[PDB]
Amino acid sequence: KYLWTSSANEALRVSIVGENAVQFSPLFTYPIYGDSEKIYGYKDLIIHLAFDSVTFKPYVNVKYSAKLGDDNIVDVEKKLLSFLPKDDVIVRDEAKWVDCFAEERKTHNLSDVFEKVSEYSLNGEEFVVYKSSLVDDFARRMHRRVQIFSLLFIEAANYIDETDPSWQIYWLLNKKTKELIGFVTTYKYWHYLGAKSFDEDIDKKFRAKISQFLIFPPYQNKGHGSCLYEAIIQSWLEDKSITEITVEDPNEAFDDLRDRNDIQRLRKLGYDAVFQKHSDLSDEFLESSRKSLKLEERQFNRLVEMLLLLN
Amino acid sequence: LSVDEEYDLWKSNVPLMYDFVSETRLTWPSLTVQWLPTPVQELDGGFIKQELIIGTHTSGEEENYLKFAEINLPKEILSSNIRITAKYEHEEEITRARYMPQDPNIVATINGQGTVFLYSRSEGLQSTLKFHKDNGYALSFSTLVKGRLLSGSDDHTVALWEVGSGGDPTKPVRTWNDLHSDIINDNKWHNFNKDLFGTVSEDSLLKINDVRANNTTIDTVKCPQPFNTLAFSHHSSNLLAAAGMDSYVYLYDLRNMKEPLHHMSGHEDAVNNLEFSTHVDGVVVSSGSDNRLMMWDLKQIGAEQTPDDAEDGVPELIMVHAGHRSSVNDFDLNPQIPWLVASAEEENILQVWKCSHSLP
Amino acid sequence: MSVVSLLGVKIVNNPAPFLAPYQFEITFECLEQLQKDLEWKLTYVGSATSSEYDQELDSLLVGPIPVGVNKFLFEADAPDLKRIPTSEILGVTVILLTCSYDGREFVRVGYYVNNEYDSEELTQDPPAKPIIERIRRNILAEKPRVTRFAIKWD
Amino acid sequence: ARTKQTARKSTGGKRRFQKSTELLIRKLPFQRLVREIAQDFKTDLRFQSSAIGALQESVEAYLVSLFEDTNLAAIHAKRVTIQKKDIKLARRLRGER
Amino acid sequence: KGLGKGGAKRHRKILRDNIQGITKPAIRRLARRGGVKRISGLIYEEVRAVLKSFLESVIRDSVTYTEHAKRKTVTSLDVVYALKRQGRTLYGF
Numbered sequence A: 001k002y003l004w005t006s007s008a009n010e011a012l013r014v015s016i017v018g019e020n021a022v023q024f025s026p027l028f029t030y031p032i033y034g035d036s037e038k039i040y041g042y043k044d045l046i047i048h049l050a051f052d053s054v055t056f057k058p059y060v061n062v063k064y065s066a067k068l069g070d071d072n073i074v075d076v077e078k079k080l081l082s083f084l085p086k087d088d089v090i091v092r093d094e095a096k097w098v099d100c101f102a103e104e105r106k107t108h109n110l111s112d113v114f115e116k117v118s119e120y121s122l123n124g125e126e127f128v129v130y131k132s133s134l135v136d137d138f139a140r141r142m143h144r145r146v147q148i149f150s151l152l153f154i155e156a157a158n159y160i161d162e163t164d165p166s167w168q169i170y171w172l173l174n175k176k177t178k179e180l181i182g183f184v185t186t187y188k189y190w191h192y193l194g195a196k197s198f199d200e201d202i203d204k205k206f207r208a209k210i211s212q213f214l215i216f217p218p219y220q221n222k223g224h225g226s227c228l229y230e231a232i233i234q235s236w237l238e239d240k241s242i243t244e245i246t247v248e249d250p251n252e253a254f255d256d257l258r259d260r261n262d263i264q265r266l267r268k269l270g271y272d273a274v275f276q277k278h279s280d281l282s283d284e285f286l287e288s289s290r291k292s293l294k295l296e297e298r299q300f301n302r303l304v305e306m307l308l309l310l311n
Numbered sequence B: 001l002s003v004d005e006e007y008d009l010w011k012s013n014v015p016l017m018y019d020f021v022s023e024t025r026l027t028w029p030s031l032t033v034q035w036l037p038t039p040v041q042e043l044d045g046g047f048i049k050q051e052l053i054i055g056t057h058t059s060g061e062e063e064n065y066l067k068f069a070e071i072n073l074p075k076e077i078l079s080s081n082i083r084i085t086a087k088y089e090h091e092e093e094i095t096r097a098r099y100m101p102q103d104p105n106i107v108a109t110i111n112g113q114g115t116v117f118l119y120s121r122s123e124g125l126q127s128t129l130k131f132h133k134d135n136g137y138a139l140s141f142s143t144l145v146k147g148r149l150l151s152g153s154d155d156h157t158v159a160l161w162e163v164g165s166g167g168d169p170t171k172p173v174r175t176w177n178d179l180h181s182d183i184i185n186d187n188k189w190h191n192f193n194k195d196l197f198g199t200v201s202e203d204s205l206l207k208i209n210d211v212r213a214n215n216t217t218i219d220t221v222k223c224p225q226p227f228n229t230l231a232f233s234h235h236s237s238n239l240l241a242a243a244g245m246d247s248y249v250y251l252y253d254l255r256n257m258k259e260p261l262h263h264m265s266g267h268e269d270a271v272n273n274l275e276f277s278t279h280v281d282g283v284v285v286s287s288g289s290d291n292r293l294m295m296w297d298l299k300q301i302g303a304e305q306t307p308d309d310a311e312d313g314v315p316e317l318i319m320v321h322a323g324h325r326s327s328v329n330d331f332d333l334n335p336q337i338p339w340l341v342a343s344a345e346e347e348n349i350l351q352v353w354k355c356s357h358s359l360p
Numbered sequence C: 001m002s003v004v005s006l007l008g009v010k011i012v013n014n015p016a017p018f019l020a021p022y023q024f025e026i027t028f029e030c031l032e033q034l035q036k037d038l039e040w041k042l043t044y045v046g047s048a049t050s051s052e053y054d055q056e057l058d059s060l061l062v063g064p065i066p067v068g069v070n071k072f073l074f075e076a077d078a079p080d081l082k083r084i085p086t087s088e089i090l091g092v093t094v095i096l097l098t099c100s101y102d103g104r105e106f107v108r109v110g111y112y113v114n115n116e117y118d119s120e121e122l123t124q125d126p127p128a129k130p131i132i133e134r135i136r137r138n139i140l141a142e143k144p145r146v147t148r149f150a151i152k153w154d
Numbered sequence D: 001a002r003t004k005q006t007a008r009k010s011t012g013g014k015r016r017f018q019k020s021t022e023l024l025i026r027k028l029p030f031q032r033l034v035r036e037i038a039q040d041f042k043t044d045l046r047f048q049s050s051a052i053g054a055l056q057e058s059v060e061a062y063l064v065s066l067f068e069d070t071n072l073a074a075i076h077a078k079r080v081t082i083q084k085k086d087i088k089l090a091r092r093l094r095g096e097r
Numbered sequence E: 001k002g003l004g005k006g007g008a009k010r011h012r013k014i015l016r017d018n019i020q021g022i023t024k025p026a027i028r029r030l031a032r033r034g035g036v037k038r039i040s041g042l043i044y045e046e047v048r049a050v051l052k053s054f055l056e057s058v059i060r061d062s063v064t065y066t067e068h069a070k071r072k073t074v075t076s077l078d079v080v081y082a083l084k085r086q087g088r089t090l091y092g093f
Ligand SMILES: CC(C)(COP(=O)(O)OP(=O)(O)OC[C@H]1O[C@@H](n2cnc3c(N)ncnc32)[C@H](O)[C@@H]1OP(=O)(O)O)[C@@H](O)C(=O)NCCC(=O)NCCS
Pocket: A153, A154, A211, A212, A213, A214, A215, A216, A219, A220, A221, A222, A223, A224, A225, A226, A227, A250, A251, A253, A254, A256, A257, A260
């Protein structure tokens, strides 16, 4: 019929299975199938990538009514499997996948190995946030399973180095069902403040950075992302070793989420009244506030000129 | 992507990048450079006279000289002829030359055979301290004890001399034939503890050592790869930096040496020289075999970065200098003129430059 | 190029009570016959935070302009303080005199105006909500900012 | 792991000099900013180097005069530290809104 | 090292927030000319805004003048004639 090309964005259908299997398309497939995001050689191509809603056991099934036998034709399934955890994906056998994740759910005690960070109730439902390091083996497995979402929904995302111990990972789960709602990979940098500050006390101080932030499409737009950002920022404010809160190359979506929640936080502390009542504020006051909030300087100035446009 | 094409690019961008550049081709390639502590003397017509110690390397061709030269800089640097004020015949060649901090007239040199010499600008060769029997690269004066000198050679031996007293300067006050199993790539004195000094070896070990103590070693660090140079900060007593074959510049806290604070990337080959700034707390300069010099601002480690400049490099890389066309043998920051740098390349070129940033 | 030109402005009542009307003696020149009318507008910046607080005080049209040197007395009542933020009536603000020929603005003159209490007792402890009658304005007319634009005359 | 070079003597050329005279803002980030502005304009026109130099000189003159007037407005407010309000007033003096 | 969004962007690179490239010390120096002795802390964003507004207007006028001359390159003289539209200013009469 002369239609042996298709779009990897509509050909790839990601699924997350609870009692209902929720399906959705990816935002970017180019790091997998090239900048064209076009796959040639397959007629009526479907790529089913499914994850168990609790263990995220991957299952890949590539269906096509016809595929050209030429050597140059790309191998969709092999391409895709190169990015999923090696020897951890059930390919084209649904019963095997179901058995596997059913026997994994029996012993999958996520909340028992990670360190609790905080809870929060949303729409009348309790959700939990957990923190883990990427050197732990179970953390490594779960991260390699949920890692492909970084590539599929975050432009320019790249897999991170798991040998590096500075990587922290926050997991957002449903407390009563154990379904993984989202994850945030963050990194700690050393923060030099001058010979005096660094010489005073022994404790290494850090610039904490949010590197990857993902809420799975099914659970998006329910308030989750905001609650997760606020829980992480709160745990970092309570932490003595953190001195700045940064974010890597945020796109407009995360830009707006960040600005919304940061303005909310600053309003809860009465900075709106302070900044609308005074323009004489001394540099000591500005610096003390900027460091108490643990906000980056540029973001701090943005938020100041924002709070000045209230009411 | 050729050396000469890259150089044409660099000299096309020279105006926008530097407040001052001065290229000078040397008869023989100098292996060491150091600014002398000459107070800024006002001259006629907006000239400023600075002095330099340079060496020679003829490789058995002709006689080598410790050269004292004088550069004239425009007055604007503070806020056109290069002359040799003095020469001195020198045995073999100078690998590193450091003037005594407390006495700018003395000058210590180490040659390709490990012999250490003490020259005087006024008279010349004053002392011949001979303890090493192999080419040595490490030579450091203590800025706290007048006449306390550390020398380090390829024969695993480190030597401590005292030239402050007039008695027996020729013999070493202490020796260590057993501090490392291999070449001493460099040793440096601490800038606040008059009894601490650090060494780096090809045995891929970095040792913080004490002189008073009998241990003589109070911290050891396994390096990823061998370290070629190290430097202590001029503002913090607990902070040091090191660089070696893996092109990353590591930073260490002296109170917890088990783990590098942070390592900065950006060099494409081994790094041979490294020095902290004496003016701006947190500025570090490095040079390597990639013909590149790089200035980092420690206070920018892991800072937020607008994506436009994100591709440009890690946020802690203040600037890069690619005017050299071959491996950089040595360089020095002017202790009186901040951000004024002198550098010497393998291809008989001595550059004197100041970058245009002006923001610490 | 320009056919009409501002030779000078001169405020008459300055300093003056905050409510006294604005009076400007404007001396200008006309080099040749023009058909349209000159238009004098006077705007008062009610607040520095935003622009919606501007107040166009009063426009005045004159015509035809007689060739030669002309004197014109331009008056306009003080601003409406019901439209000025209670907090920003006292202090430094700006006024803008604008002369335009046939809807085309050819001269803009920016002035700083300082609103101060008359007695030291008040300026040292300004009452909660200001006392209008004891406010005095002083428009610093020594060196106003005179921007000149090129238009088409006829 | 230093590598000792082989001494290659230089006869003649086997000496260039560059000094700097300019304005306050540095030249490169201003080219950055002007290219950013030209991008958001859908424009495709070439921008000559001397044209960017003239833009820079004019921007600096404008900012210096605006700071003159802002410092002046602050003087007449009896203080010495110039605030947002004084910058806004000064900018309102030129006809900006 | 330590980055997870350091891959290869799907599309072209676009310039954002190059205004922030106006270093605070640069604004401070410009303020020193004109005799600004002390400057507040939250004044920098307004100076950014004003500078960007003025430069946008001037560049737009330059593009208008050049496009009107039926040419494809804006030259220094085009910028002169664009600044012309800003009017001639004097303090006093
Ligand atoms: C960014 C992301 C985490 C948002 O997750 P989310 O669960 O949809 O977030 P929220 O539930 O907080 O809803 C966010 C939106 O609600 C808005 N909002 C407005 N009023 C609100 C309120 N009263 N309560 C909550 N949210 C509110 C937020 O400002 C934001 O703006 P928008 O509604 O105009 O889009 C999600 O889009 C995602 O994971 N995307 C993947 C790709 C990506 O961009 N990742 C992050 C980049 S590193």
